[PDB]
Every structure is written in C-alpha cells, then in structure tokens.
Design brief:
Largest sheet of chain A: 6 strands, mixed
Largest sheet of chain B: 7 strands, mixed
Structural class of chain B: mainly beta
PDB class: protein transport
Chains A, C: T9SS component cytoplasmic membrane protein PorM
Largest interface: A-C, 58 and 49 residues
Structural class of chain A: mainly beta
Number of domains of chain A: 2
Number of strands of chain B: 12
Distance between the termini of chain A: 54 Å
Strand content of chain B: over 45%
Entry title: C-terminal part (residues 315-516) of PorM with the llama nanobody nb130
Helix content of chain A: under 10%
Helix content of chain B: under 10%
Distance between the termini of chain B: 36 Å
Radius of gyration of chain B: 14 Å
Oligomer: heterotetramer
Number of helices of chain B: 1
Radius of gyration of chain A: 23 Å
Assembly: tetrameric
Shape of chain A: elongated
Keywords: Type IV Secretion System (T9SS), nanobody, protein transport
Order of helices and strands of chain A: EEEEEEEEEEEEHEEEHEEE
Strand content of chain A: over 45%
C-alpha cells in the first residue's frame, strides 16, 4: 500500500470517491459505514457524501473471511469546505462553440449574449458546480469616476446591459464583489476579472 | 476607515426582548460580512452571530441559536441583533463587527475568528436582571 | 485492530516541487526491510516515512518497492501515482498596520501609505495557512486618468516600478486601481496567470 | 483579435540551422503565452515549443529538446524559433500560436493542448534536405 499521508479529507456537499481496501480481501467482502452523511458502494469504490463543514467523519470497515466478519480500525477524516471558485463569462464563439472567458479581450456581442457571470474551479477536478449569488460591474466615465453597478443575481441588470452597450472598443470594465455559493452550502467572495471590450 | 456605532443597549428583565442596531459610516456596507461579539465580566469574549454579504448565510453561537436573530438593511447601512428570551448569562457589552471585504469564504470557523474582522464598534451594555 | 486502507481518490496524488510524505507498508514487514525507488524525482526515507519530491508535472510517478527476508529478492507491486501542479495562488498586498502587525490585503480599501510601504505584490494560497511559497514574477496596475483613459503600468518584477509609485502617490481618497496580469511562480516550477484585485484608496 | 504572421521558413540542409520569426499585431503581446506547432505530411499535428508570459518557463517536445530554442521580444511583438541540428523529420509547416490571456497555469500538458491557444498563424514551410 502506497498512500500519500495528507489524504484524510472529504469535501462537504459533493461525492467523494474513496478506495477502501483490506489486503488480500476481494472488494465484495469489504463493507463500510460513515457517521456523517452517506457512504455508497459503486464498483470498486465507496462514495462519501458528508454534510457539515468543519466536522469529522468516521469510517468503519468490516471484512468477510469465510464465516467471520472482522472489524478493522476506524478512520477519522476532516470534512472541509470546497475550494473557492473563480469567475468567468460563458460565451458562444462565431462557430457556436461554448467558451469560458477568464480575462483579457471579449466582444460586446459575446458579453451581452452571455447575459451574466458564472463561477467554477479552474481544474478538471472536482465534479462541482458553483452559483453566482450577486456581483458588481465597475465602469469608468470620461471624468475618470468609477461607476459600480449591482447585478440581478447571476444575470446582468438592465443598468449593467446599458453600460456595456455604450462601451467602445478598447474600453475596460471590472467584474467585482462576486459572491458565489457552492453545494457545500458555503457563500464566498471571489476575485475580480478585467474585461477589455474587443 | 469604516466606523461602527451601536445603539439600543440597556436594562431588560429575564425572559424579555431587546433589539440592538449598528450603523456603519460610508457607502461600502454591502461589501462586508456583519456580526456581533459579546464580552461579559470575568469571561472570555464570545462570538454571537454573523451574516454574509448577501444575507443568504448566517452563523449563530450554540448558546443563542433559536433565541437571537441577525438581519441587515443595506439601504440603511445597518445590522440588527434581535434578542429574545433573555437570560442573566446574556449580560455583556455587545460589539458590532464588519469584515471579509476581500476574497475568502464565510464558514462557521472564519465567522467565529475575531482576526477576520477589521472593524469593531464601540460596544453597547446589555444588563439582564 | 487490523488496518484497512481508506484513501479518497481526489487526495491520492503527488504534488510537484513539495514534500510528499508517503506511507509505504507491506503487511507483517518491519519498516527497516522496506526499500523504494521512484522514476520522477527523489524518494528518501524519514524513519518509517518516505518523502517523494517529484519534478515533472503531468508525468506519472512509478514507485517500485522491494524487500529482503524471504527467498532471494521479493518483488512488490509497482504502484503508480499522478503528479499534479500545485494549486494556483491568489494575489495580495502585504502591509503593516499602525501597531506594526503584518496583514494581507485581499481586496477592498487600503491606505496609500500602506500600499507604498508594501512596495509590491505577493501571491499565496488563501487557505493558507503556512505552507507553499509562491513568487510574483510581474504584474500590471491599471489606473484611470482625469480623461477617463485606462493607464496600464508595468512592474519591476514583484516590486512597484517608479511610474506605478508616482501614479499611486497622486491618487485621492476613494480613487480605484486594479492589480492585473499577475504572473506567479511556484516551487513546482510552474508559471501561472492569476486573477485581479481592486484597490480602493483610503 | 490578434493576427500572427510567420517568416523565415525555407530550404535547409540536414545538420543546419534556421530561425523562424512570428510577428503579432496589436499591443497585447505580453499578455500571451507564445508557441509553435508543426504539421508534417501524413502525420498528426505536433506541439513543438511554447514560452510563458515572462519568458522564465519554457516547454519543448522531447524530439526537439536541446536542438530548438524559443525566445520572445515583447518590444518587437515577436516570438522566435531557433532551430539547430535540423533533421529530415523536422520537415513540416510550422505554425505560430498565442494563447493563455486569461487566468490559468502554463504546464507541459496545457502547453501541448491546441485548445489552449485562441490565435493561430498562417504557417511557414520548413524543408530539411538529406
């Protein structure tokens, strides 16, 4: 068994696949339970879905050997909040392909067609969807004054749309004060992105 | 530079109710997590409650859960603490807090952490007889 | 009493450029008889423990385990672990408050004196708490003049350039600027572009 | 959108050297990871090399490592490919790329991913004679 030591972590509100193994014991002979949320067998793995952030989850394991159930040592794991996501603008290119804008230049038509802001981890793992609760767009007038405009949930408000519509090529605005929520039930403030109108 | 000023403190009988208010100066109230801590004589400072930027997430200390309620009014730059079923153990100086202006999550653990709040009020005395 | 291996698959990975302690165990075999090799970096022993320090991100690491007690040379399996890049850090401004305490600005309001005394930008995992150190390679500051034009100003590595300092010095209370194009490097040897932060002058 | 135009391609003898150049339009060159892909007749497109925003990190295909060098000149909005010890297997159309304008890491895996680059050049033909 070759196991990285810092691995007793589960994320709340998502499926956590766990490899539970007993040396020399076939998968079907291994049975496992959890004291926090659910632990479901799926193929050669056990899927943990814990519920409260900052709590501990104890996994109890039994192995069948002939006509006897052997109790294994219990394992304690830390239930953590999910990592915080990053904002992006989901748009469709001229070929109709879905793309994620993560900073730099973007056309006015693409911004408006997106209709709002999204938030996700910038990584293949985990299998997680986050929601944008609210955000602000900060625009700059000819006098160099900042004009913060409040959203309509994850969607652009009518005031935001009008401000975007009157922006010329090379003009910039900022996606700020982005509040995101995850399936762990946690609300987080995430960083800004600059949008340069192309 | 945000300044917090509490009001509504005073003497109340056991079983009674009292609402505390905390007005924040400036025009950035909506960018803060707002909360309350309390300090009783000869006791450690205790976290009472805190409310997320949107109001969609609230954390309460176990000792006040189901008795105290927090709410925010962004239009008035005010956070409120409604205390109900007041006990002599609730006698303390109540201090309003504001923090979490930058990026980061609002967990039970971070809500309870006094170091997560840059702005602290003046404190208001609540005496439960 | 008997030991079951309970390993979350999302956590059963190696990270390039850091200490990766690995518990390598053979049932009924004492720590002193276990011997291990790796095809990505080093695998040195810290008593009962094994520390893997892989170098190539994305390449799989092969852990060969051998022991001497039985026949001649007992060959074990032969395990493979994924070598991942470290997570990407977030920018911050490290400043000292009036009491001399070190603080991390992560967005919102900050005094001009605190910004200038910081002298530049930093990058770290928010978590944090210690744990991995990242470096700011370069960044831009975007200012807005009296004509409403955006003025992007290039840094001097992790430090503010003289042009950036002059722009910060002439900002009035309530004026805003943006920390953008932040390039950060980690001990995994990876360079990453990280998100922006807004700075409101106090 | 950024336009990329390559130059310097042509016929070269085996063992020889050749430098390709790729000029980018606009004033945002420094915000991109710059690179090269190549396409030989009857072969899959191959990643060649890419250089990070700062120039401090570079990824090379195993087949070109120690033979090809990439460099960038932000002042000239130009990325260069210095090819040395050229082999007949290096005969291909070389296309300059620009990407990674948004947040994200520059790893060997992402450098090799054609989807990570929004801007592609015109291609330049390099012929290596035996």
């Amino acid at each position: 068994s070759v196991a990285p030591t810092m691995m007793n972590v589960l994320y709340a509100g998502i499926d956590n696949p766990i490899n539970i193994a007993v040396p020399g014991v076939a998968q079907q002979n291994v049975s496992a339970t959890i004291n926090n949320g659910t632990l479901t067998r799926r193929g050669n793995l056990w899927i943990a879905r814990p519920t409260k952030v900052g709590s501990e989850a104890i996994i109890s394991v039994t192995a069948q050997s002939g006509g006897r159930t052997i109790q294994m040592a219990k394992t304690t794991l830390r239930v953590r909040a999910l990592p915080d996501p990053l904002p992006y603008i989901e748009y469709k290119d001229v070929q109709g392909n879905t793309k994620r804008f993560k900073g730099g230049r973007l056309g006015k038509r693409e911004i408006l067609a997106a209709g709002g802001i999204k938030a996700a981890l910038d990584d293949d793992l985990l299998e997680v969807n986050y929601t944008v609760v609210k955000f602000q767009l900060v625009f700059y007038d000819s006098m160099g004054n900042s004009i913060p405009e409040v959203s309509d949930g994850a969607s652009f408000s009518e005031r935001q749309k009008r401000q975007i519509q009157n922006l010329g090529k090379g003009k910039r605005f900022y996606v700020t004060e982005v509040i995101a929520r995850g399936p762990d039930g946690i609300e987080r403030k995430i960083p800004a992105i600059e949008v340069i109108v192309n | 530079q945000v300044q917090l000023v509490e009001s509504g403190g005073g003497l109340v009988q056991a079983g009674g109710s009292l609402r505390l208010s905390c007005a924040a100066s400036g025009r950035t109230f909506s960018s803060y997590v707002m909360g309350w801590f309390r300090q009783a004589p000869g006791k450690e400072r205790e976290f009472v409650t805190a409310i997320s930027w949107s109001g969609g997430s609230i954390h309460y200390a176990d000792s006040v859960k189901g008795r105290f309620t927090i709410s925010r009014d962004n239009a008035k730059n005010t956070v409120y603490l409604q205390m109900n079923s007041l006990k002599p153990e609730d006698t303390a100086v109540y201090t309003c807090v504001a923090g979490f202006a930058g990026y980061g999550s609002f967990t039970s653990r971070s809500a309870r952490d006094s170091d997560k709040y840059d702005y602290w009020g003046q404190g208001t005395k609540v005496t439960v007889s």
